[PDB]
Ligand binder design. Sequence first.
Ligand SMILES: Nc1ncnc2c1ncn2[C@@H]1O[C@@H]2COP(=O)(O)O[C@H]2[C@H]1O
Ligand SMILES: Nc1ncnc2c1ncn2[C@@H]1O[C@@H]2COP(=O)(O)O[C@H]2[C@H]1O
Lengths: 225, 224
Amino acid sequence: GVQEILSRAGIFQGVDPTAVNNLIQDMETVRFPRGATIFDEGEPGDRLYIITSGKVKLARHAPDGRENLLTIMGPSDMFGELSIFDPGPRTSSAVCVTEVHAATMNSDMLRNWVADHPAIAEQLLRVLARRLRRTNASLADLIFTDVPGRVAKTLLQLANRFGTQEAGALRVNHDLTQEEIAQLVGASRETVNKALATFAHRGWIRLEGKSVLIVDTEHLARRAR
Amino acid sequence: GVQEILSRAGIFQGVDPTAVNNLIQDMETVRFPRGATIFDEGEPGDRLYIITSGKVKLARHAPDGRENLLTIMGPSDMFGELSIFDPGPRTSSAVCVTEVHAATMNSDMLRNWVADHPAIAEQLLRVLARRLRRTNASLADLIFTDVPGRVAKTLLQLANRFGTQEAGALRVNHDLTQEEIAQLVGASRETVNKALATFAHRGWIRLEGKSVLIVDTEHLARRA
Ligand SMILES: Nc1ncnc2c1ncn2[C@@H]1O[C@@H]2COP(=O)(O)O[C@H]2[C@H]1O
Ligand SMILES: Nc1ncnc2c1ncn2[C@@H]1O[C@@H]2COP(=O)(O)O[C@H]2[C@H]1O
């Protein structure tokens, strides 16, 4: 239910359960339709969001119109915190990939919570560190891996985040377009298409809409690195 | 003369000088010779560092052995926090470019600090948040900036960090080998040498061993 999903967000881990239930209760429930923009990169804001259902992509923009997708968040994930702790523009656009349900609060509310519960501040440090940890790997990936290996990685990352076991395989209803997968990878639409085709062609994965079955993890794993 | 250099670290910014002064004194010092590894990528860490003197490069490693440098840290810079707040292995090596002196603390001392002083907590959050903002930009530069644009950016970052006025021009004693420079930029030595020679052929920059003089910053800044 909504309170169990919210209770799993990093920001509440090990924190007093009671304080958690009460804090959840002062959060606002919102719902966005698919494709809605929650905020744009460069906007100022200090609202924070914790998703309870659906997927939100976080997009950054190059002067020439193009975009890379930093990541795709889903239920229990948090975004919006960064502008609070380092005041400044949104470091990306948050856009609903599906219909999205989230809990949200302003930064006054968050600050008061932290003042009542220092453990929150500690969990927030773990959250930003873990994000530096992941993003550093993405950067390494751009420096050291070829496009096909990067595509492979991206897919295994989607599988770990959103994958279901389905008749021996990983069902990954990622809901992304072809171009968006590419933006997630940080490479051209053609190369990324090429690699994807290759991987289907070998039987490693199976395309089927904005969804992928991943049937030999290890082969795809071998190909990344 | 360690106290003042340390008080210039991000973790203490705006924090009370006497609370800063008191906290500095629980920090434990270490010294390393030139070329030493303080710690390796994948090592489990428990220790935080703030450099008081000299330079540290933070490197990542591909299985086939090649290296990339995330950044170069000097006096006042803080590293090793990531493993403390997200327990897990080191996200890079730390290697001594020059002889390095540093103040350190382990994770139990830092948790105390974070739990006892909201302002230090706040500062740390600000430090990680700003590192995210910066890394995002690096990652975008890889995808969208041309190689010589990156060199230009890497030079000015070095100048922004270690630049000292000289002859109306910026003197930048970075202490790096061309390979290291290339590895900071994160591109083939061929491309990074060729872009360095160009800016020279002009007169934006002059090479000298492991030191650069940036004469006209304006145009270098422009080239980013
Ligand atoms: N590299 C990243 N990895 C994961 N999340 C990020 C990353 N960069 C930014 N974000 C999230 O994207 C949000 C965009 O708005 P803020 O900058 O307010 O806060 C940002 C973070 O919550
Ligand atoms: N993107 C980054 N920007 C600045 N410093 C970093 C970055 N990534 C890692 N580091 C520093 O390098 C240190 C390596 O050890 P830790 O992972 O514990 O902590 C890391 C950070 O202190």
